[PDB]
Amino acid sequence: MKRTFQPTVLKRKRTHGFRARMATKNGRKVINARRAKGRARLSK
Amino acid sequence: KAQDLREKSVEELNAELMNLLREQFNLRMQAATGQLQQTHTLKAVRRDIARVKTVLTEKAGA
């Protein structure tokens, strides 16, 4: 049965990637939040 | 090494540098082949190069 995760790298990057996060105010808020939390991985 | 390098001109400083760099090449080749027993010399030449590159940066401009 087709399950929900049908990964493509390009779609992962364009949605959740660093340059995508950095493009928007609220994305930067996420990166800053994760950077404050101490998260090793800021982006996907 | 040391301030001796500062007595030397920028030209002769560069001449040392190239020699050191060549010695450092030989030691890499030996280290890989397993001919190098005296491993202490690698850190020596590497530090000696830095001393020269320090002086050369001093001698640059001033």
Partner: protein, 93 residues
């Protein structure tokens, strides 16, 4: 225009390997571990200058480093760029 400093940094070590040995014996090819930045032109220059040989061809690959577990902490080894350098016929290194 490749400087001598560049030439003295490009070749990191010879590569020792059954495959490397075959290459040398069969196809007159010396396998080196070259710097990651090294380009096929820089590698040819370096091989010619530092070994006084005439190079026919340079083929390069990067081997991506192995992940290793080392008890608790996983970690990757470093990527190696190797250069298969074919010497012209008659030349030995």
């Amino acid at each position: 225009m490749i400087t001598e400093e560049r030439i003295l940094k490009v070749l990191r070590a010879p590569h020792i390997s059954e495959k490397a040995t075959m290459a040398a014996e069969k196809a007159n090819t010396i396998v080196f571990k070259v710097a990651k930045d090294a380009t096929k032109k820089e590698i040819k220059a370096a091989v010619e200058k530092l070994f006084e040989v005439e190079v026919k061809s340079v083929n390069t690959l990067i081997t991506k480093g192995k992940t290793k577990r080392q008890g608790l902490r996983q970690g990757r080894r470093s990527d190696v760029k190797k250069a298969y350098v074919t010497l012209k016929e008659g030349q030995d290194l």
